[PDB]
Amino acid sequence: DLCQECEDIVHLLTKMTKEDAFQEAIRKFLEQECDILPLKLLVPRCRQVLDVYLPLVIDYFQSQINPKAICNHVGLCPR
Amino acid sequence: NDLCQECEDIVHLLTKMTKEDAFQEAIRKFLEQECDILPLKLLVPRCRQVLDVYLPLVIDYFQSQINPKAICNHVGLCPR
Ligand SMILES: CCCCCC/C=C/CCCCCCCC(=O)OC[C@H](COP(=O)(O)OCCN)OC(=O)CCCCCCC/C=C/CCCCCCCC
Ligand SMILES: CCCCCC/C=C\CCCCCCCC(=O)OC[C@H](COP(=O)(O)OCCN)OC(=O)CCCCCCC/C=C\CCCCCCCC
Ligand SMILES: CCCCCC/C=C\CCCCCCCC(=O)OC[C@H](COP(=O)(O)OCCN)OC(=O)CCCCCCC/C=C\CCCCCCCC
């Protein structure tokens, strides 16, 4: 049941993004990855992209989202 | 505070989902669509080719002999 597993992942992400520890951990991990391969080459200006977009993703998962619509958008739930 | 367990749960869900071909097909279609538009079109040079090369590798990685706690340790959500 892909739809339900995707919805569960979305729910878990909504829970995890509420903790500052989560943001700090993912920030440090991605900052380390941005300085080495593969990301260093695959994503130009990796660190700046990270600085700008990690807070936006955190906010997004803390906002009023529609899990079934999200999972439909990526093709894992029907409409 | 129990981020470690939530991370392990996400990893387990991903391992389950990567077992289905419908998953690979759907994520492939979604990311192929995204590679042709903003933001990815600009953030990831040669997005479509990067996708073609790396999506099977990520799928295999989550289908392989992995330890969810080890992944979560690597990304800093379980302590070690
Ligand atoms: C490039 C190839 C790399 C190999 C694979 C490695 C995967 C990397 C994941 C990067 C994917 C970046 C996709 C960015 C596309 C995007 O910005 O669309 C998000 C849109 C736009 O939202 P808004 O403009 O704010 O308006 C609607 C309000 N809800 O939001 C969505 O509805 C979709 C959210 C996607 C997150 C869903 C996560 C659920 C988990 C599913 C299973 C796990 C697979 C995840 C793979 C990535 C797919 C997101
Ligand atoms: C570019 C930053 C933009 C900020 C927004 C973030 C949006 C989407 C996430 C972008 C995905 C980029 C991830 C880079 C992964 C990478 O290149 O690292 C390679 C390494 C090399 O693997 P190995 O050393 O062989 O593993 C041994 C450990 N047992 O990959 C890894 O180690 C595994 C990392 C996978 C972690 C996923 C676990 C899921 C946990 C929580 C999900 C919620 C957080 C999502 C962010 C994590 C992104 C990976
Ligand atoms: C790894 C499995 C974990 C599953 C968790 C899902 C992880 C990430 C979900 C992605 C977050 C989507 C939420 C959208 C919320 C939002 O408002 O952002 C939408 C914005 C819209 O962008 P714009 O505002 O239009 O900017 C235009 C100016 N350039 O889009 C995004 O946030 C997406 C940014 C992500 C940047 C991706 C860069 C990394 C991409 C590919 C790296 C591939 C590495 C693979 C290596 C694997 C090695 C084996």
Curated annotation (Swiss-Prot), chain A:
It is found in: Secreted, Extracellular space, Surface film. Coiled coil: none annotated. Residues 1-79 form the Saposin B-type domain. It comes from the Eukaryota. Homodimer; disulfide-linked. Pulmonary surfactant-associated proteins promote alveolar stability by lowering the surface tension at the air-liquid interface in the peripheral air spaces. SP-B increases the collapse pressure of palmitic acid to nearly 70 millinewtons per meter. Pulmonary surfactant consists of 90% lipid and 10% protein. There are 4 surfactant-associated proteins: 2 collagenous, carbohydrate-binding glycoproteins (SP-A and SP-D) and 2 small hydrophobic proteins (SP-B and SP-C). This is Pulmonary surfactant-associated protein B. It comes from Mus musculus (Mouse). The gene is Sftpb. The chain holds residues 66 to 144 of 377 of the full protein.
